[PDB]
């Protein structure tokens, strides 16, 4: 347990984000996946209302998550949406994606934000079982509707 | 209506209009002891590149509108649009103006190039699964929501 490392990534953590990114395309298994040229990569890098945590071995990635800062028009202290979240499939089960989730949560109230959200698809029973053992504070059941654009 | 119903995008002189939405809200929503945000917070949230207001207005009375949040992507340089809020003042339900809100928005951020324009509503919302599926979205997934209520 010693061994594993949680980072929340800088502006200068290209490298990390990168390899996190190709974590996301295996653990999701996205076919024929054409990552975005690094300028882009490192503009939403730099951007102060987005934020990566990474879990690491060494300095091998072995899982992360993505999250958003959503400022409120309700209240002064902000939302995060925890958008992405994976672990290597050779190390799960092992406490990291726990790990990821209390680092985060953590982050955000000493930056004193109101709450976290996070989704998983109803038909993801693994993420489920996962989301439902991190203590949520409550969950509900969506409806997500999308529109792709011309 | 629809010769008389406008629909605005707010931008950062807009804040009168932003606070008048926000009161909207509140009625709408029925919201209780709302203490409304300073207007230097709400100034600087209109002032974000990553955020986007739209309003229906019949003259000078806004009777909708909706907030929405940009989300740059890491899979793709197209980005995409979340609509956080959508509400129409009650005497004014039922004749359109939703309808019209969500296609100004899906315009927009197609003029924009994004790849994705998503909303959603909760699965006990039936009157608003009901407008969301008329609007004709591509697609409609279910979704389960935990959120981690912070000390
Ligand atoms: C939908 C809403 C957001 C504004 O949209 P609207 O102006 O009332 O709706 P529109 O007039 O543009 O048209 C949508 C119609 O809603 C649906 N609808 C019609 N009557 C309805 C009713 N009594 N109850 C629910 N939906 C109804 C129709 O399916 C649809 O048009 P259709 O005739 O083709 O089937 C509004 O009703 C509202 O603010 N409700 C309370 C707040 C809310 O739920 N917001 C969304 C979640 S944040
Ligand atoms: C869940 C996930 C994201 C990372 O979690 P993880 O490190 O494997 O999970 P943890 O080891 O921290 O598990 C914590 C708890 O989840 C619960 N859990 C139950 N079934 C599980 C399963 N099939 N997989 C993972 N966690 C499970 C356990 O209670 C577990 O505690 P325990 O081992 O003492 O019983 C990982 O399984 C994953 O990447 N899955 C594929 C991608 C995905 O679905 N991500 C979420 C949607 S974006
Ligand atoms: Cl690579
Ligand atoms: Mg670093
Ligand atoms: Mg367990
Ligand atoms: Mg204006």
Do not use: C
Request: glycine share 4%; no cysteine.
């Amino acid at each position: 347990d010693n061994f594993l490392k949680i980072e929340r990534l800088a502006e200068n953590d290209l490298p990390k984000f990168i390899q996190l990114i190709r974590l996301f395309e295996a653990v999701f298994e996205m076919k024929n996946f054409s990552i975005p040229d690094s300028e882009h990569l490192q503009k939403l890098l730099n951007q102060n209302n987005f934020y990566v945590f990474v879990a690491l071995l060494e300095n091998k990635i072995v899982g992360g998550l993505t999250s958003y800062v959503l400022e409120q028009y309700y209240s002064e202290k902000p939302l995060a949406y925890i958008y992405d979240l994976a672990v290597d499939t050779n190390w799960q089960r092992q406490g990291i994606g726990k790990k990821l989730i209390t680092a985060t949560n953590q982050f955000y109230t000493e930056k004193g934000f109101e709450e976290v959200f996070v989704q998983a698809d109803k038909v993801d029973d693994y993420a489920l079982d996962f989301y439902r053992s991190t203590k949520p504070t409550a969950e509900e059941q969506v409806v997500h509707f999308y529109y792709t654009l011309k």
